[PDB]
Amino acid sequence: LNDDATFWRNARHHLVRYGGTFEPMIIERAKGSFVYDADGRAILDFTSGAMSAVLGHCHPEIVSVIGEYAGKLDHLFSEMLSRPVVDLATRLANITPPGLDRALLLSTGAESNEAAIRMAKLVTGKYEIVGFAQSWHGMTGAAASATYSAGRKGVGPAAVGSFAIPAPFTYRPRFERNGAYDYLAELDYAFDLIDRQSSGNLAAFIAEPILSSGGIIELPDGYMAALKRKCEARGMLLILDEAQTGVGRTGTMFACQRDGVTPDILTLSKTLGAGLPLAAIVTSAAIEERAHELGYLFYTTHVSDPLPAAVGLRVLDVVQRDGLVARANVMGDRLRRGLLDLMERFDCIGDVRGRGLLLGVEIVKDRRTKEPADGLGAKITRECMNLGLSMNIVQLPGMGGVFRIAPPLTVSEDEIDLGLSLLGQAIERAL
Numbered sequence: 001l002n003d004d005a006t007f008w009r010n011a012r013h014h015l016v017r018y019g020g021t022f023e024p025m026i027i028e029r030a031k032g033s034f035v036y037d038a039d040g041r042a043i044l045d046f047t048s049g050a051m052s053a054v055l056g057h058c059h060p061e062i063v064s065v066i067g068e069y070a071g072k073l074d075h076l077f078s079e080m081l082s083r084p085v086v087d088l089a090t091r092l093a094n095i096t097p098p099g100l101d102r103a104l105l106l107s108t109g110a111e112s113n114e115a116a117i118r119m120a121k122l123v124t125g126k127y128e129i130v131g132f133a134q135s136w137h138g139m140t141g142a143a144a145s146a147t148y149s150a151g152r153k154g155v156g157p158a159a160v161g162s163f164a165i166p167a168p169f170t171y172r173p174r175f176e177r178n179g180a181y182d183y184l185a186e187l188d189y190a191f192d193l194i195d196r197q198s199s200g201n202l203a204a205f206i207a208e209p210i211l212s213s214g215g216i217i218e219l220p221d222g223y224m225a226a227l228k229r230k231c232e233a234r235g236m237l238l239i240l241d242e243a244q245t246g247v248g249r250t251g252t253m254f255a256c257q258r259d260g261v262t263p264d265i266l267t268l269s270k271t272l273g274a275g276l277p278l279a280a281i282v283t284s285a286a287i288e289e290r291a292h293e294l295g296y297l298f299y300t301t302h303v304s305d306p307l308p309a310a311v312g313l314r315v316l317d318v319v320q321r322d323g324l325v326a327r328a329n330v331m332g333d334r335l336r337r338g339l340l341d342l343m344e345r346f347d348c349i350g351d352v353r354g355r356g357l358l359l360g361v362e363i364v365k366d367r368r369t370k371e372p373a374d375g376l377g378a379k380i381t382r383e384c385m386n387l388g389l390s391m392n393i394v395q396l397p398g399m400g401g402v403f404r405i406a407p408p409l410t411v412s413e414d415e416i417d418l419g420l421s422l423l424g425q426a427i428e429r430a431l
């Protein structure tokens with residue numbers, strides 16, 4: 001049973017608490033879209049772990065390549081090159097939009113955004129970084145200073161030159177222009193204010209194609225392009241953080257491709273490692289060449305490490321030959337319709353949004369006032385677990401509890417259905 005007393009005692013005596021609250025179970029194993037506790041209960045992983053496992057848990061391809069390299073090429077001096085590294089770097093150059101040519105293979109999302117930010121500040125000679133009011137880029141220094149969804153208090157000053165403009169949020173609009181929500185005018189409004197505060201050292205703007213932590217907020221039509229132009233006008237770089245949107249989760253290999261707006265630097269992680277610690281940034285040959293002249297430096301233990309690079313190249317291998325980016329739209333629409341049907345049966349569901357296999361459901365006390373559903377959200381999530389469905393709900397002020405649904409890009413038609421079924425039941429029990 002999950003009640004192992006020795007387990008929870010050790011877990012209580014020797015575990016540092018880092019946010020949230022631990023699941024009252026002991027996950028024994030995982031396969032495909034399921035994790036299993038000590039009793040063997042199958043739990044549908046509707047969050048792909050930490051929004052990472054795009055090929056599902058313990059996927060055969062990955063299990064073999066990892067072992068393959070674990071025993072062949074593992075770790076190397078950070079100045080030695082290998083085929084897995086040059087191949088992944090080259091692949092990424094090829095699957096990312098034209099303009100993105102060079103890659104740096106790292107380990108974490110925060111670490112990758114750090115890399116992009118350091119390179120931007122260097123190349124631009126400036127140091128001010130602008131992000132979204134409800135963004136999330138990591139727990140480390142710069143990634144954390146550009147993160148406004150959570151973690152800014154009780155830990156001292158943020159990084160110097162940290163600004164944030166509101167994120168365009170169509171469901172909860174607050175910027176009107178002609179009786180309509182003008183999120184583009186809201187962009188200009190925001191940046192003017194930015195300019196007024198800027199010390200004249202704006203280096204770049206980090207942005208998530210779809211703000212995940214911030215409640216799955218997809219940037220409206222024309223925003224990305226507009227944003228991109230705002231940055232060019234000020235000689236700023238546009239850093240697109242696709243840690244969760246990258247690698248076909250939204251139905252395109254890269255969300256930035258949807259808008260057709262390629263950034264100056266692109267950072268990848270979560271979905272790129274498919275569960276392992278592999279991350280990377282990709283930039284133009286112009287910026288890289290320049291950053292090089294300025295002596296750019298981002299020397300880590302695991303940068304250009306054989307094993308991770310190999311798994312990453314494999315994750316891209318299968319995602320491609322198995323057209324999971326498409327599986328993402330196919331299964332994403334199945335999940336979406338189902339959610340709309342449930343939204344159709346329950347009033348607490350005020351909104352269903354997102355793209356591809358990164359959907360979001362907002363629980364509200366009532367459509368009319370769109371008043372956040374207090375506790376209900378937590379309850380439904382609680383109920384889902386009992387029913388054997390692993391869900392995740394994020395809660396920010398002035399916004400209802402948002403369920404972040406993101407199963408593997410490998411989910412089956414039935415697995416999707418199973419999920420819908422359990423969610424519907426959970427909502428019935430929560431009310």
Ligand SMILES: *Cc1c(COP(=O)(O)O)cnc(C)c1O
Pocket residue numbers: 107108109110111113136137138139208212213241242243244269270
């Ligand atoms: C998850 C997340 C990260 C943080 O990456 P870590 O691997 O936890 O350091 C970075 N960017 C975005 C958009 C994320 O959602």
Ligand SMILES: [K+]
Pocket residue numbers: 075076077078079300301302303304305
């Ligand atoms: K190394």
Ligand code: NA
Pocket residue numbers: 092093094095096097098099100101
């Ligand atoms: Na490219």
